[PDB]
Amino acid sequence: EQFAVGEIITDMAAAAWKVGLPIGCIYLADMNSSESVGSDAPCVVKVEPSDNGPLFTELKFYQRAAKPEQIQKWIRTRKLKYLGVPKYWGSGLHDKNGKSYRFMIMDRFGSDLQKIYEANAKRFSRKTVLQLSLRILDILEYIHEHEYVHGDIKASNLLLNYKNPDQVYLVDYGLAYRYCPEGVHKAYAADPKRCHDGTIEFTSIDAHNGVAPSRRGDLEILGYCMIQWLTGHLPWEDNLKDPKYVRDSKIRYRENIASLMDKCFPAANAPGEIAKYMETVKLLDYTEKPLYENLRDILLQGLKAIGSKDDGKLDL
Ligand SMILES: C#CCN1C(=O)[C@@H](C)N(C)c2nc(Nc3cc(F)c(O)c(F)c3)ncc21
Ligand SMILES: [Cl-]
């Protein structure tokens, strides 16, 4: 028990918070007041031993790229409805029982997409998949432009806004990677300070080859998520215990995207924007910056094809 329930904690900027019950070491949190922290709390507090490396990595990302006005400024200038990076509210050090703990205050959210995906018998519609992926491309553009890649996009790292079910957020930056510190892209090689390969069914070819993740990796990961979400499957899913097999199929299907479309979708009935998406991500060099707006225009053509538009509705 890192906290006394209902106690007041003070972050290093002197902002006061009350700590609440744990959710479903993450506790509900709110601003300091005479009211207690309830079920509808707007924040969470994450706490870990101060020697926990992932929370320090995640904390530094949030400090650098997730300041509330930093996000709000981007939303206005890029003319967006919202932006699915969670907001950083504060952090500090907390000693209890002769042990040191690091804590971090963040937005609270509703359900993860993996639970909702499983509740639909492992299918999201083409409307949902295009609408989700457009907003992830906005998220990925943002974090990429602030020198980070996520490396682990998947439904269970996608949380709905608690008070708005058409807003999705990308969470979990504990094994995120600073690919571009001070504008200097990392070279095509391994990084000994890291050793996360991703989640095996969705990770990039780069990651399978043991090099540090980069921007094209994230778009590749999203590509595989799109097919998983549309079809309920990935070709290599019955052999996840062998990373050699999974790298081999991914490399082979990268070289022949039509055979991936034929393998995953019913014969002569595959969504053209997905194939077109994969083909564009294929062209990217390791260090290259994606043309994010063209990737979104590709997914926009798809919404046009199904008699729809980017109206922000995820339809969950
Ligand atoms: C109650 C409840 C709902 N609820 C859940 O069911 C599960 C899916 N989780 C994990 C939640 N996470 C958060 N915040 C969060 C913020 C961040 F910034 C993170 O990086 C992060 F990992 C988590 N808020 C609420 C939930
Ligand atoms: Cl104490």
Among the bound ligands, the one closest to the CA of 96: 2
Q: How was this structure determined?
A: X-ray
Q: If DSSP states are collapsed to H, E and C, what string results for 185-203?
A: CCCCCCCCCCCCCCCCCCC
CB 311 within 8 A of CB 209: no
State whether the beta carbon of 61 lies less than 6 angstroms from ligand 1. Answer: no
3-state helix, strand, coil in the chain (%, to 5): 40, 20, 40
Is 24 annotated to bind ligand?
A: yes
CATH second-level architecture of 110-316? Orthogonal Bundle (1.10)
Q: Where are the domains of the chain?
A: 1-109, 110-316
CA distance 65 to 60: 8
DSSP 177: B
State whether the beta carbon of 159 lies less than 6 angstroms from ligand 1. Answer: yes
State whether the beta carbon of 20 lies less than 6 angstroms from ligand 1. Answer: no
CB 284 within 8 A of CB 213: no
Active-site pick, 107, 152, 206, 218: 152
Residue 256: helix, strand or coil by DSSP?
coil
Among the bound ligands, the one closest to the CA of 38: 1
Report CA-CA distances (Å) from 267 to 215, 255, 260, 277: 32, 19, 11, 19
CA distance 107 to 84: 11
Residue 13: helix, strand or coil by DSSP?
coil
CB 128 within 8 A of CB 316: yes
* 243 Cα: distance to centroid of ligand 1 (angstroms): 30
The helix (H) or strand (E) run that includes residue 170 is: strand 164-170
CA distance 135 to 310: 10
Is 264 annotated to bind ligand?
A: no
Q: Pull the structure tokens for residue 295.
A: 């990737």
Among the bound ligands, the one closest to the CA of 98: 2
Q: Examine the residue annotation and report whether 311 is marked as an active-site residue of this protein.
A: no
Q: Which atom of ligand 1 is nearest to the CA of 88?
A: 18
Pocket test for ligand 1, best of 21, 39, 171 (most atoms within 8 A of CB): 171
Q: If DSSP states are collapsed to H, E and C, what string results for 121-154?
A: CCCCCHHHHHHHHHHHHHHHHHHHHCCCECCCCC
Helices 215-231 and 257-264: angle between axes, nearest 10 degrees: 30
Cα end-to-end span (Å), the chain:
36
